[PDB]
């Protein structure tokens, strides 16, 4: 995603991305992205750690999940809004056209 | 160094051209330059301070860049940007200040601080840009070994000097002849006095002369020359040359006779003006020589005759004078003047942070002391330090 | 002419924005402009100098373009460029100087030198660009015949004048009444004296007045007006009006009474201030009129009463005065002031090259003589010559 | 307010960089900014003056954008432009002066004149630029 | 056009023009070679719109 997407079509790191083995390549992308919409996706995605903490109806540790996700959904709405402003330059035409 | 410069014009032309609304295509050329920076930086660590009462703040870099899309700018865009700028501002301030205090006998013209020494590094050169700020402009032209030059309104070329020279005196100090003056900043006032009103002088004329040697050559000077020295036109009780007693000066003013001002360069007369008061131009000089005379009035009404008897006591002391002010001039060396805040900025930062006296500059950056012994080392350090002050004032005033 | 301008801003914005590092994109718009020049020039041939001690120099053009290729700038790129700039610099200098010396009565406005006359040619007009330099800005607006305007600090509007007028005098000069003054640059000091302390004057008040007519209208003037004329507050021995003898002035100062300053324009009062000392604004005027009075103190302590007897001899001379200084103002005509180096640049180039006195300007570009008879021809020549000096100072100081 | 600012640097950097003989590309980035303005303006009408001896003049906008004749401008290009600038100059003058006389104790830090109050409106913000003065 | 018609018989070849996608190719030929007649075409065509 990172490479064949975002970064270049978004014009940012035209240095495509060089990863050896840090701690979460998908993430780090955050610290250096100038477009909030894009930027929230990142922290939320690199988190949403499957909030592994529950003890219901009497002893049922069933690693739960965000109300957010649940049906607050917005995540989606935001996942979209961020997408809604990824439409720009760098390489051949048949590219952006097709992608966007 | 030049590096440093950019960092600012970057931010200024930034905190200036990036506002809610403007059209992108006005900053396209700019935006770029900016990012380019962030890159070169990220992955670097710095440290400033450590001297006197100057805090030691540490810095790291790790930033995202900026969108390129958007016909126009939305408020949100700015705020996410301004937040990044503010870290650089608060940075540079600390960078400037840290290199604005250290002095070095040896290479007082080179970078000092751990902060800057690291910048002159090659890997950072990829950031230079738009050097049009008068000071940096001259910083370059010099580094290449060429002809510099600056502009000053009421330059500060004369170290403070207020004194007198008695050419004829006696214990009672009742029949003196000599000159007294005040050289300070861009002004000179000098008076020649003769208690005897040239009664026994050849042609009843007493000659006077005042020579002032500049520590640096001034070129293209616009100067006001006026007859009379108001500062020495009133009654005074003055200490004797040896400090053992006090004498009385009771002036009465006459027009200076045969006034001749010479602006010399290395002993050669470059400009000479005979009795010309008002505005005159001195195009290149390192010395000013003012010659003027007191001529006993050949014809005197009774009231005048009464002031000048043939014999002592001499109670009214004939005095002639001149006033010369350098309104503007150009100097190849940095100087303090009446408009620029450089000296005040450097002096102020050092005072605020209790910076200890160093090996180059006089205590308190005292101007008179500095210009009196304006050594090459003091000038190189002063220029470095003035250029940094000017870089700082583009963002922080 | 405008042509000329460009040539510089080209070089400045060049020797400035072009350095080891930066991105192409920041100069793309610039680079172009540059090349465009080289082209138009190449093939053409010039000639400068030939007058007085000015060397004659010929110049030819045959230069390569610029690599519009690269991404960033490598050291090598610069040096191959700087080498080309230096020939243009050393050129322009010689061009400016050559046209900064010639004067002309008939058409003292248009170009003179073989060098420039050739530039006004149409085939070169392909070079104009960025005319934000205050002077050229006004050069244009004047061609289109519109409202110009410059900015000055301590302008130089008053030709030097230091004199007196005795309204009541007698051979012994023991009971005089009149005024003495000094008008010079942006300042006026005037004192009114009455040896009799208005003893026989109606209402024991002596009226004084000082009128100064400017050679050009000043608008938006910020002025300091203070009571007293320090310059005329001390004892003096002065030459009589006919030069046959000398009189004695022994002032004692009283506050000027009923002070009224009027700034008139074509005989009409535009601004009037009654006894207001400090900072006042005169928005548009060609004349200043200062009226003030000496009023004999109605109540006097013994020490005061002793200075002013009912009968002569009058030994203490009652004096009242005013000091007026124009700190800043705008003028539609170029003038010398306390900050700009134009007059000094023009005067200096002419002096250095031993340029012979011409038909327009007074010997030595003497300011007092120039402003005293500021004819249309002198002003057009002065403006041309000042504008060129300003173009030159963008590169050579 | 900031709005106001632009209006000028627009004109200055205009009456300055737009002359008989400069290559188009030296104003490409500029030209744009300019037009952008004309657009936002046209249609809306203004009132200046209405105090002391200050005249009440009515300004209205109806202008055509700017061409782009390639390779350095031809004289003709300028004159058709200068004619449009002069209406804005004579305008701003009247705008400045009108807001340069009104004072207010309560909120004497904000726009007073009917002329400027209308500018702080959002639909105009689209102009602001080069805040270096 | 740029690489087979104008440069190639106008002694302007030298570099048979190397382009690698995106930015504008007419455009850039404008600010490169000099000639007035040729030069007007470029601006009029390039910046010509509706």
| Distance of alpha carbon E46 from alpha carbon E26, whole angstroms | 7
Q: What is the DSSP letter of A64?
A: -
- Within this chain, do residues B379 and B309 fall inside the same structural domain, yes or no? no
DSSP C145-184: T----EEEESB--EEEEEEEEEEE--TT-SS-EEEEEEEE
Header resolution in angstroms: 3.8
Closest of B172, B324, B176 to residue B250, by C-alpha: B176
Shortest CB distance from B64 goes to which of A11, A34, A89?
A: A34
Residues whose CB falls within 8 Å of the CB of residue C380, separated by 6 or more in sequence, listed in order: C108, C109
Whether residue D131 lies within 8 A of chain B, CB to CB, comes out as yes
How far are the Cα atoms of C93, C160, E41 from residue D77, in angstroms, in the given order? Answer: 33, 49, 17
CA angle C384, C386, C392 (to 5 degrees): 105
For residue E6, the distance in angstroms to the closest alpha carbon of chain A comes to: 24
Q: Is C82 helix (H, G, I), strand (E, B) or coil?
A: helix
Distance CA C180, CA C183 (A): 10
C-beta separation of B142 from B332 below 8 A: no
Where among B283, B313, B328 does a domain terminate? Answer: B328
Left, alpha or beta for B340 (phi > 0: left; psi -120 to 50: alpha)? beta
Q: Kindly state the DSSP code that residue B256 receives in the 8-state scheme.
A: P
Q: Which two tokens stand for residue A30?
A: 């955050």
**DSSP characters for C182-224?**
EEEETEEEEEEEETTTTTTSGGGEEEEEEEEEEEEEEEEEEEE
Q: What method did the depositors use to determine the structure? A: cryo-EM
Tokens of B125: 């050169």
CB B65 within 8 A of CB B38: yes
Residue at a domain's end among B328, B346, B361: B328
Residue C144 and residue C167 in one domain: no
**Residue D97, phi then psi, degrees to nearest 5:** -45, -45
Burial class (CB in 10 A: 0-12, 13-18, 19+), D60: exposed
The verdict on C350 and C302 lying in the same domain is no
* Residue found under tokens 């910083």: B139
Q: Are residues C12 and C141 in the same domain?
A: yes
Dihedral pair phi/psi, residue C313, rounded to 5° = -70, 140
The full DSSP string for chain D is -HHHHHHHHHHHHHHHH--TT--GGGTHHHHHHHHHHHHHHTT-EEE---BTTB---EEE---------SSS--HHHHHHHHHHHHHHHHHHHHHHHHHSS---STTTTS--SHHHHTTSSGGGGGG------
What's the CATH number where C17 sits? 1.10.1350.10
Mutation target vs D (from C36, C142, C283; most D CBs, 10 A cutoff): C36
Q: Kindly report the nearest CA distance between residue B64 and chain A, in angstroms.
A: 2
* B156 in Cβ contact with B328 (< 8 Å): no
Q: Is the dihedral of CA B133, B137, B138, B139 positive or negative?
A: positive
- What is the rounded distance in angstroms from the CA atom of residue C342 to the CA atom of residue D67? 39
Number of domains in chain C: 2
Domain that holds residue C199: 159-328
Q: Do C129 and D22 touch (CB under 8 A)?
A: yes
DSSP string, B266-297: TTEEEEEEES--EEEEEEEEEEEEEEEEEE--
Closest CA to E31 of E43, E22, E23: E43
| B236 contacts B269 by C-beta, under 8 angstroms | no
Q: Which of C90, C39, C31, C33 has the alpha carbon at shortest distance from C64?
A: C39
Which positions of B make up the binding site for Zn(2+)?
A: 153
Question: In the Cβ-directed half-sphere of B313, how many Cα atoms lie within 13 Å?
Answer: 7
Do residues C113 and C60 share a domain?
yes
Contacts of D24 in chain E (CB under 8 A): 43, 47
Q: Give one DSSP letter per residue of C313-369, joined into a string.
A: ---SEEEEEEEEEEEEEEESS---BSS--HHHHHHHHHHHTTPPP-SSSPGGG-HHH
Compute the distance between CA of residue B1 and CA of residue C243 in angstroms, rounded to an integer: 66
Q: Measured between CB atoms, does B328 come within 8 Å of chain C?
A: yes
Q: Are C304 and C362 in the same domain?
A: no
Q: How far apart are CA B316 and CA B196, in angstroms?
A: 9
Work out whether the CA dihedral B77, B81, B82, B83 comes out positive or negative.
positive
Same domain for C386 and C263, yes or no, is no
Chain centre to alpha carbon of residue B127: 32
Same domain, B5 and B81: yes
In this structure, the strands spanning B317-331 and B251-253 are parallel
Q: For residues B271 and C120, what is the distance between their CA atoms, to the nearest angstrom?
A: 36
B276 contact residues in C (CB cutoff 8 A): 366
CB of D48 closer than 8 Å to CB of D94:
yes
CATH (domain of B233): 2.60.120.170
Q: Do B84 and B208 sit in the same domain of this protein?
A: no
C-alpha neighbours within 13 Å on the C-beta side of residue D25 = 23
Structure-token pair, residue B346: 């450097």
Token reading at C334: 């170029």
User: Where is the domain boundary, B309, B328, B347?
Assistant: B328
Do B123 and B38 fall into the same domain? Answer: yes
Q: What distance lies between CA A21 and its chain's CA centroid?
A: 19
Identify the helix (H) or strand (E) that includes residue E44: helix E36-46
Contacts of E22 in chain A (CB under 8 A): 89-93
Task: Record the tokens describing residue B7, joined without a space.
Answer: 């960092």
Question: In this structure, are C110 and C29 located in the same domain?
Answer: yes
Distance CA C239, CA C248 (A): 9
Cα B375 to Cα C362: distance, rounded to the nearest angstrom: 41
Q: Do B126 and C245 touch (CB under 8 A)?
A: no
Interface with B, mutate which of A34, A41, A42 (most B CBs under 10 A): A34
Taking alpha carbons only, the member of C89, C247, C226 closest to residue B255 is C247
**Do C145 and C163 sit in the same domain of this protein?**
no
């Amino acid at each position: 995603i990172v490479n064949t997407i975002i970064y270049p079509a978004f014009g940012m790191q035209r240095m495509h991305y060089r990863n050896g083995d840090p701690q979460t390549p998908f993430q780090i992308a955050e610290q250096q992205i100038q477009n909030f919409q894009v930027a929230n996706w990142l922290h939320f995605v690199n988190n949403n750690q499957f909030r592994q903490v529950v003890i219901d109806g009497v002893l049922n540790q069933v690693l739960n999940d965000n109300i957010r996700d649940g049906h607050v959904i917005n995540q989606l709405m935001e996942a979209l809004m961020q997408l809604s402003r990824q439409q720009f330059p760098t390489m051949p035409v048949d590219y952006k056209r097709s992608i966007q | 160094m030049d590096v440093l410069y950019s960092l600012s014009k970057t931010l200024k032309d930034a905190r200036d051209k990036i506002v809610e609304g403007t059209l992108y295509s006005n900053v396209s050329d700019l935006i770029q330059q900016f990012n380019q920076m962030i890159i070169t930086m990220n992955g670097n660590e710095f440290q400033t301070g450590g001297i006197g009462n100057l805090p030691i703040r540490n810095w790291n870099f790790d930033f995202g860049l900026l969108g390129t899309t958007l016909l126009n700018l939305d408020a949100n865009y700015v705020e996410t940007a301004r937040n990044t700028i503010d870290y650089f501002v608060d940075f540079v301030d600390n960078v400037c200040m840290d290199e604005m205090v250290r002095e070095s006998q040896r290479n007082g013209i080179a970078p000092q601080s751990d902060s800057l020494i690291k910048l002159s590094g090659i890997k950072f050169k990829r950031i230079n840009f738009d050097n049009s700020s008068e000071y940096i402009e001259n910083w370059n032209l010099q580094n290449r070994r060429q002809r510099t030059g600056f502009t000053f309104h009421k330059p500060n070329i004369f170290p403070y000097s207020a004194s007198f020279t008695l050419n004829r005196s006696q214990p009672a100090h009742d029949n003196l002849m000599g000159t007294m003056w005040l050289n300070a900043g861009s002004e000179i006032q000098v008076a020649g006095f003769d208690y005897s009103c040239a009664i026994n002088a050849p042609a009843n004329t007493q000659q006077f002369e005042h020579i002032v040697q500049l520590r640096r050559v001034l070129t293209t000077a616009t100067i006001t020359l006026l007859p009379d020295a108001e500062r020495f036109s009133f009654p005074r009780v003055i200490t004797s040359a040896d400090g053992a007693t006090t004498w009385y000066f009771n002036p009465v003013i006459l027009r200076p006779n045969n006034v001749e001002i010479e602006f010399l360069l290395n002993g050669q007369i470059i400009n000479t003006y005979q009795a010309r008061f008002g505005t005159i131009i001195a195009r290149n000089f390192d010395t000013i020589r003012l010659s003027f005379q007191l001529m006993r009035p050949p014809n005197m009404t009774p009231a005048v005759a009464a002031l000048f008897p043939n014999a002592q006591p001499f109670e009214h002391h004939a005095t002639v004078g001149l006033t010369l002010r350098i309104e503007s001039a150009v100097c190849e060396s940095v100087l303090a003047d009446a408009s620029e805040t450089m000296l005040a900025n450097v002096t102020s930062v050092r005072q605020e942070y209790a910076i200890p006296v160093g090996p180059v500059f006089p205590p308190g950056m005292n101007w008179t002391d500095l210009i009196t012994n304006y050594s090459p080392s003091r000038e190189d350090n002063l220029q470095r330090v003035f250029t940094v002050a000017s870089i700082r004032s583009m963002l922080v005033k």
